[model samples]
Target chain A: GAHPGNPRHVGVILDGNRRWAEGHGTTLEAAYARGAARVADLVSWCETEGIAVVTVWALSRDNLRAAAVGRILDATAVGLAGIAASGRWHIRLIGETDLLPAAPARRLRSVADRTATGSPGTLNVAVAYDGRADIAGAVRGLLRSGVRESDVERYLSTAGLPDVDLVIRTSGERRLSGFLPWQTAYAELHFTAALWPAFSFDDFTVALRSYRAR
Target chain B: GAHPGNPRHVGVILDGNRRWAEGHGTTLEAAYARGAARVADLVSWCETEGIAVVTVWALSRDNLRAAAVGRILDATAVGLAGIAASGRWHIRLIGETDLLPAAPARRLRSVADRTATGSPGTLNVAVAYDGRADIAGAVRGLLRSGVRESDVERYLSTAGLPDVDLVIRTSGERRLSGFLPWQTAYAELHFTAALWPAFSFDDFTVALRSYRAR
Candidate 1:
């Protein structure tokens, strides 16, 4: 397969699901379901396009509050489990899974385990993840493992992975919102006004085309 | 005099003098001289606006090796010396002055000494500076001063000063280019397409307005 020389590993900041739901007068569960379907489609598209890695920021530590966390977690777990069991992908849950409830964590682990020996294509679902938190966690892990300061890079979660080539953020947010701080040092940022559930293949293609132009 | 809670500190990454000169069909020296004059105007504007601190990025370490370095240093020294002699402003050469030639370093030190007790309005001119180098230097200084890891923040250059409120980069460069890495953690970024010499008060006012709007 003849791939583009600048092979892009994409990171998608799936923002504004609740706002999308509110705007559309729909339930949060409905929004999550739509978002999950979109993710499945996007994952399949990337798999066909020969893209190596696709990271979807599903949740952040700040979003893990007691108020609505359980419902969000349940929705995410169900969605990701289905995607993993679809037999067309490899799924990895990246970030502090310990911050999640026991059942969600267990479910995520099982899905990841099931997909561990699947195809080369990967879907990294970042839950309870902030780039700063990831860096801090990597540093802490390195220190705890008795790794020397100079060898800290070897211990990073995305150590062998290529830097994120393109970051697509939905809902018109200009700021990075702390997505892969260390990894996105030179990534091409694409901002779209389309809300998460409303993000279509055309919108995603527009972002990819802009990055290609750059 | 009543000052609004910690007047915003503005850091200008004055970039693209050569490119600006090329665009204007002028010699690099002529362009640099004009750029120096523009810097003086920037300082004056900051003074007029009652901005507490104005840091202008005058030279980078990479710039020191250029053939035009001597001329640029001479021009900056002349312009800054004039400002310092006016006694309305305090000038601080906030970089590795030892990397510069003896005459330029002496000239900069003389200006700093002359403006040592001038007023609350201060201009920090970064010459022979790199932000990464600054962090490395600070870390080394911390180690030299027997400061523990916990107290390292106290030994940083801008330790006593308020955090940088906004960073304005001229020349349309979207990236930070390693300016004030540690200090600019939460600073609002304002990027302008106008080249250094071409940046006018109107441009600055527009940036201020945008900041306010944000």
Candidate 2:
């Protein structure tokens, strides 16, 4: 936040919730709720450090098949509503928003509208997301605007934001799974055995330190 | 070799050769030479296991700045010439050939041309390749051909190739660094602490076995 070497934006792939829940003998709903709460805490942590942006991937296109989506959606609404109420950060969603059912979709849209113009920091909430779908949308957006190829960056959902600086995936899975694929050309990646809900401030701190030392 | 449960096309980012050299107190040329030999061994390994396509990153666009480029280019030429002589693999070069010094450029293209029509196994040797540049060129080609955006697959250097199933990088880095970024939307990534020159068939076998088991 203060100067060079600090990350401009940090992207998190929310993973291992169900596994963690099952492993702990906890309910999947509990896992979703905890993961949702964890997201806010981490973003709050980033804000305190003056991280300009924080990106969290909470939903994938495949998540639509998992009933856990409802619980996570509820938790996301509550968590992001807290962010909206705080008036400390700008919140943006990256996804095919229309895919959500009417009520959740409306709630998400309302939260987005309410927090579209906050200050000093940004939170990117990715839901209803598929990486291939996201890029195809960007390509279509560029063509629809009749922009040149060089202008691709300007039309991205990221828009003026820098590409991701560090991407951390919990659950110890090393696969990219399309998380910020286009934006991650040079981003350093960190994989942890920690589940998303169990991912600690210490883990995040270590990730930043490793990146800073790099 | 067998067919089922085998990856159709496997791509690798050859890395850590220089560090391997320095760690051993050996010259970079020997490192590149050993890495080149390793590549041949691995491609033949893939052939024995019924993997149809093998794409290897031996040089990068940014490698032009390194003094070790001479040694690496020499090693790569020798390795691919051996591949050409084998006549069992069709080889394609993915990169800006014009960016190379005249002699190496001629040698690479000659090897590529000589092996272009060979069969059963396909080897993609990315010489001056940079993933971003490769995709940018693909985009331009798409525009010039009046093709649909979704058709970017057909325009890639790995045109007609299956999506990369598993991507392995040595030196223990967890990032993609844009190797087959577009094609790897769903790839399983495996990272090893092993250096490039030290990446063994055993390590490669373990990666494939894990993917197969998954």
Candidate 3:
């Protein structure tokens, strides 16, 4: 009963940090700062619960264009790199690091390099990622390869990883906005109104409970 | 204010027919019949609201393999063929029809052929669709053609249509389940608890209202 229907891979649409700042009459950076700090807590909780892989939607393709959002993402990246150093989990920077500014991009790779071996858990940080972009990337790679037809899973970024068991989108947003499209093909989704920084233990528990029920 | 940012193209995940049947203690065929009947209501509503195109997810790639579900989908094809005869909307059967059973597949193609000419509104029915498969199929075609990278949109099933502006999934489900993944890159999503057969006019308007607010 303890582990009944636990999600093997969970992808989260980490949303509403900027809007969270607006709600508190605070700066966007303040929201990002709080959200960044909260990531560790969330990751720790996942580790304790024995969740295998956590795919965090830290940045979308469009988020890279918004300076305020980008700044927060930069801060989040730095924190994630530090998390990798702690060695509790392996870190996979899952998006287009090539699309990022050289310094930040290099930092992402540095963290990836640091955790090249393995860990008990995985934190898949989706930065500069778009569902369509990833699909196109997979197809581009497919065109140059021998794998053909419906076995499209082999060519996708999340190839070896299991399909997302559950996807949680916070801050009242119902849209996926292209988060882990290939992996989330049959994912049970949980939507919550709580902003990213404010996502609590109860919020996560609810998501898990919903997943179990489904 | 009359239109309030009406979506140019809308995609719907037609779900809950199986659940609707269970809820009513009725046959699966009854659920399918009701759901099929509801499609025209939705398309007519969209046409009335000036939505240029509507792509309805009637079947998943996995769905084609299910006999009960496939029978209903076959009924839907016949009804939609009659709609094609009305000459008000152009019909396009999106997805791997080549993968479906012979007669039903031929019927799907026949509807597309019947509406090959121009029409004011467009109806795209996704039968035997897997989002990853769709992109792979597109890329396969592109590789065999002169299509270049970054021009992926022009190669997808919904090539001539605008990117989806809004997507709605009913039956309390929160994920897109790979419906029009390429086109839904930035689509606003609305999820409702109401089953597809019971999806009220009020529910649809609420989705439209939310889309406009965004």
Query: By the DockQ metric, which is better: model 1 or model 2?
Result: 2
First chain TM-score for all predictions: 0.89, 0.90, 0.89
Better of 1 and 2 by lDDT: 2
- Give Cα-based local distance difference scores for all models: 0.70, 0.78, 0.76
In the range A1-214, model 1's lDDT, one tens digit per residue, is 3159434688898887989999999888778777887888788777777776888988887777653666676677677766677766778777778888887578667767898766777788888875545544544455466523224335555555456878787886544655665456457667778989888889878887777675
Worst 10 residues of 2 chain B by lDDT: B140-149
lDDT of candidate 2 over A1-214, digit per residue (tens): 4457888889999999889999999987788778878887887888878887888888888778734666667667776777888788888887777787767667776787798678888888888877666555555566677634356556555454568889988987767788776788778888777999898999989998978876
Regions more than 4 Å wrong, model 2 = A3-5, A20-30, A66-71, A147-149, B1-6, B21-30, B66-71, B147-149, B209-214
Please list all clashing residue pairs in model 3, or write none if there are none: none
Candidate 3 Cα misplacement greater than 4 A, ranges: A25-27, A66-74, A116-118, A143-146, A149-151, A157-161, B22-27, B66-74, B108-112, B116-118, B146-149
- Alpha-carbon error at A17 in model 3, in Å? 2.3
Worst 10 residues of 1 chain B by lDDT: B146-155
Report the alpha-carbon TM-score of model 2 versus the true structure. 0.88
Q: What order do candidates take by TM-score, descending? A: 2, 3, 1
